């Protein structure tokens, strides 16, 4: 019975695809000396050619090479062989046309990562990854305004690029828990330099992203006897920024808009990935109130009234941004012996939305952040 | 983490599709009084339109209604809502043409089953199932000899049939174990009457299948301290038969040829589903020797030298059959904390094979039967 896949992770990310499901088999102890072996295999609703993604990581805690001072709790060495898909990416060219059908990317990557723990709050890592990116044109999914043919569009696909990316990450957390942070600050900073051959020309660039978040409880005491104490009301304020400098192939940048599982690119009230920019800044503030419901079939329920502001700009300085105001509810279901992934339903409005003068709904399967 | 899917079952059945994978979440205790709830979701390599199959069963052990003498441990009441696919079925018509591309069937079924245990060896069941069958034409997978168009072929697809099938099953086992039967006889008999509307005409028929198998050990004693005692050498002889009488839509029958996970339709040495008949009889005999290997990464290994004989016939009495001789090896892998599904590699030859005068290989992921 292939042992156990720890999770059939049901993930939603409207940017990449309709729905996603990943089965993950982890094995903490392997080869007899505490080696962690994980295999992920997922299916992502691509409405396109490629439908299966995969990953295979193998990580080493307590590497003692007796080289480069590696004597303290400072070594985690991880191999990763993976293949992911980027879906529904708009098709562009030197004319910056919008009449292309679509553009799906297969990324086959081999990565080596060295991870360090400075203080139990802090974490750092350095990953070097060789990525092969291939393209797959698709015909129309349905009736949309376009005028192209297969041959010219296939010619318009960027060639299979071979790139190498060396990056570092630094994460700082001192919060009281992982799901409903009462009092603390969570910050992170990533920076990566990469270089690769797209067709016959070599393009090299770099990118970075910083982000801070603060959570302060507001006069509450809820006691899950197992789960310590969390405030009834918590004010959360986050600000994230990102940049990309250098020369890069077309189709690389950042998309902000709507709700997204990664908190640093979510702008409720717009179309998913409506704001595209080479560098960006977003920030939001929200009341989060824990509805006093526990047990039963719903492990918990929280509500949020948020205000969000952010936007993108390009090398030509034009700070194109948007507003967002809305109300959301997160529900955690646990009637399966173990916690199934939480759901988040939000209603948001933005003044910069084009075809929706009224607000709309955002569905995200993800943590509360 | 959606709890735990008990198994990512990797299944191979060259008749239906290239490869298959099913994730199954079972819950023995549900609603507080011992109710079994199971959800299966599988992806089957269809090389066609439909790619996702599913099932949802809910069974009641020891139902007590105070009705119909139900005072013993004799009642298992099961609801089942499912949807499966039949793939790569040849496309036929009134001309019995072979130039059709393919014919895939979606079967959406709702079934109710009542099961009885007569003696701990014996078991019986009666299932009533309403099935809706839909068809899906596909263009060519690759270069093959055909000459048709989309419109006429789509017209050639039988309409979405609505059928009801009432069937009974009777299984009798008294063997010493479930994987390597030493001394015993396993027999089964199924019989089902069904009636349904295909297009505007109502077709009704019935079918049945009997089967016996005998396993006798040959001078061996292997002692897995946990797993009792199994003989080194065991002679196994099986004979299965099946019939279908009445009027039925075209495309219903039995396929025999090659190795198949279900033992009552496997004839090693031919193309998978090369012998098609409205009723059939097959039988085989085999030495099975347990290779004295245990522990390590391979939970076990057995070898077989088999002789197989069987064939089909239609209403017009023509007993078209074939021979089969070959050697196979079954390997059970267990280096994943729990037993992953066993593999069976076989090399077989048949005198009635057309394009392979020499034998060929059969791969089957399944039990030893």
Chain A residues lying within 8 Å of B6, measured CB to CB: 1, 4
DSSP per-residue string spanning B299-356: EEEEEEEEEEEEEEE-SS---EEEEEEEEEEEEEE-TTSSPPPPEEEEEEE-TT-SS-
Which residue, among B114, B134, B133, B135, has the nearest Cα to B125 in the 3D structure? B114
Taking the C-alpha atoms of residue A248 and residue B336, their distance in angstroms, rounded to an integer, is 43
Burial degree of B231 (CB within 10 A; 0-12, 13-18, 19+): buried
Rg for chain A, CA atoms, rounded: 22
Phi, psi for B215 (deg, rounded to 5):
-125, 120
DSSP per-residue string spanning A145-183: S----HHHHHHHSPP-EEEEEEEEEEEEE--S-SSS--S
Chain A residues lying within 8 Å of B1, measured CB to CB: 6-7, 9, 338-341
Cβ-nearest to A23 among B23, B27, B339: B23
Block residue for tokens 């090369």: B274
Chain B residues lying within 8 Å of A341, measured CB to CB: 1-2
| Yes or no, beta carbons of A27 and B338 under 8 Å apart | no
Q: Please, which residues have CB within 8 angstroms of residue B65's CB and are 6 or more apart in sequence?
A: none
DSSP per-residue string spanning A34-83: T-EEEEEEEEE--SSS--EEEEEEEEEES---SSTTTTSS--EEEEEEEE
Chain A residues lying within 8 Å of B25, measured CB to CB: 8, 336
Cβ-nearest to A5 among B5, B51, B341: B5
Cβ-nearest to A337 among B3, B336, B337: B3
The torsion region of residue A228 among left (phi > 0), alpha (psi -120 to 50) and beta comes to left
| Yes or no, beta carbons of A27 and B1 under 8 Å apart | no
Which residue, among B58, B51, B63, has the nearest Cα to B22 in the 3D structure? B51
| Yes or no, beta carbons of B1 and A6 under 8 Å apart | yes
Domains observed in chain A: 7-364 (2.40.160.50)
Structure token digits, residue B158? 């039988």
Q: What is the resolution of this structure in A?
A: 3.8
- CA distances to A66, A287, A343 from A346, in Å: 52, 14, 10
Which residue, among A142, A44, A133, has the nearest Cα to A102 in the 3D structure? A142
Chain A residues lying within 8 Å of B340, measured CB to CB: 1-3
8 A C-beta contact, residue A280 and residue A310: yes
Chain B residues lying within 8 Å of A10, measured CB to CB: 2
8 A C-beta contact, residue A88 and residue A61: no
8 A C-beta contact, residue A46 and residue A19: no
| Yes or no, beta carbons of A2 and B340 under 8 Å apart | yes
**Which residues on chain B place their C-beta less than 8 Å from a C-beta of chain A?**
1-10, 23, 25, 27, 43, 51, 336-341
Chain B residues lying within 8 Å of A337, measured CB to CB: 3-4, 27
Which residue, among B348, B258, B353, B351, has the nearest Cα to B304 in the 3D structure? B348
Q: Please, which residues have CB within 8 angstroms of residue A258's CB and are 6 or more apart in sequence?
A: A14, A266, A267, A268, A269, A270, A271, A272, A273, A274, A348, A362
Beta bridge partners of B275: B256
Tell me the CA end-to-end span of chain B in Å, nearest whole number. 35
Which residue, among A6, A14, A24, A43, has the nearest Cα to A365 in the 3D structure? A14
Cβ–Cβ pairs < 8 A, chains A and B: 65
Structure token digits, residue A169? 């990450």
Taking the C-alpha atoms of residue A157 and residue A359, their distance in angstroms, rounded to an integer, is 36
Vertex B29 angle, CA B28 and B32, to 5°: 165
| Yes or no, beta carbons of B338 and A2 under 8 Å apart | yes
Block residue for tokens 């046309």: A97
Phi, psi for B140 (deg, rounded to 5):
-60, 140
Kindly report the nearest CA distance between residue B121 and chain A, in angstroms: 25
B/e letters for B280-306, b = 16+ CB within 10 Å, e = fewer, are: bbbbbebebbbeeeeeeeebbbbebeb
Block residue for tokens 């050697």: B327
Taking the C-alpha atoms of residue A119 and residue A72, their distance in angstroms, rounded to an integer, is 11
Taking the C-alpha atoms of residue B356 and residue A182, their distance in angstroms, rounded to an integer, is 71
Question: In this structure, are strands B275-277 and B222-223 parallel, antiparallel, or unpaired?
Answer: unpaired
8 A C-beta contact, residue B247 and residue B220: no
Kind plus residue range of the DSSP H or E element containing B155: helix B150-156
Residues in chain B that come right before a backbone break, where C and next N are over 2.5 Å apart: none
Rg for chain B, CA atoms, rounded: 22
Q: Is A238 helix (H, G, I), strand (E, B) or coil?
A: strand
Question: In this structure, are strands B184-197 and B161-173 parallel, antiparallel, or unpaired?
Answer: antiparallel
Which residue, among B341, B344, B339, B336, has the nearest Cα to B361 in the 3D structure? B344
Q: Please, which residues have CB within 8 angstroms of residue B54's CB and are 6 or more apart in sequence?
A: B39, B40, B41, B42, B82, B83
Phi, psi for A233 (deg, rounded to 5):
-120, 135
Kindly report the nearest CA distance between residue A196 and chain B, in angstroms: 35
B/e letters for B336-347, b = 16+ CB within 10 Å, e = fewer, are: eeeebbbbbebb
Cβ-nearest to A341 among B2, B25, B340: B2
């Amino acid at each position: 019975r292939t042992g156990i896949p720890v999770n059939l992770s049901l993930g939603y990310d409207s940017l990449q695809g309709g729905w996603s499901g990943d089965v993950a088999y982890t094995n903490s102890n392997a080869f007899g000396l505490g080696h962690s072996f994980g295999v992920r295999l997922g299916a992502v609703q691509n409405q396109a050619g490629q439908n299966w993604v995969g990953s295979l990581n193998y990580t080493i805690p307590w590497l003692d090479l007796d080289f480069a001072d590696f004597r303290k709790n400072r070594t985690s060495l991880s191999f990763g062989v993976g293949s992911d898909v980027g879906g529904n990416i708009a098709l562009l060219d030197a004319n910056k046309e919008d009449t292309g059908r679509d553009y799906t990317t297969r990324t086959n990557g081999f990565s080596l990562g060295l991870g360090r723990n400075i203080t139990p709050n802090l974490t750092a890592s350095a990953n070097v990854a060789f990525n092969n990116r291939t393209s797959y044109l698709e015909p129309k999914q349905e009736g949309e305004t376009s005028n192209l043919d297969d041959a010219a569009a296939t010619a318009l696909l960027p060639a299979t690029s071979l790139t190498t990316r060396l990056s570092g990450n630094l994460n700082y957390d001192n919060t009281d828990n992982v799901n409903f942070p009462g009092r603390g600050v969570r910050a992170y900073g990533a920076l990566g330099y990469n270089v690769g051959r797209a067709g016959d020309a070599p393009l090299s660039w770099t990118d970075g992203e910083i982000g801070v978040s603060g959570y302060y409880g507001f006069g509450g005491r809820i006691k899950r006897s197992f789960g310590l104490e969390t405030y009834r009301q918590v004010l959360a304020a986050r600000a994230n920024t990102g940049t990309t400098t250098g020369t890069f192939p077309d189709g690389t940048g950042y998309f902000i808009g709507g709700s997204n599982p990664l908190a640093s690119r979510e702008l409720r009230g717009l179309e998913d990935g409506q704001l595209f920019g080479t560098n960006y800044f977003s920030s939001s503030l929200e009341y989060r109130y824990d509805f006093g419901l526990s047990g039963g079939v719903a492990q918990g329920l929280y509500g949020v009234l948020f205000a969000d502001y952010g936007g993108v700009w390009n090398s030509g300085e034009a700070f194109r941004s948007a507003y967002g105001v809305g109300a959301g509810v997160q529900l955690n279901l646990g009637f399966g012996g173990a916690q199934l992934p939480s759901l988040r339903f939000d209603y948001g409005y933005s003044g910069q939305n084009a075809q929706k003068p009224n607000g709309r709904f955002h569905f995200r399967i993800g943590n509360f952040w």
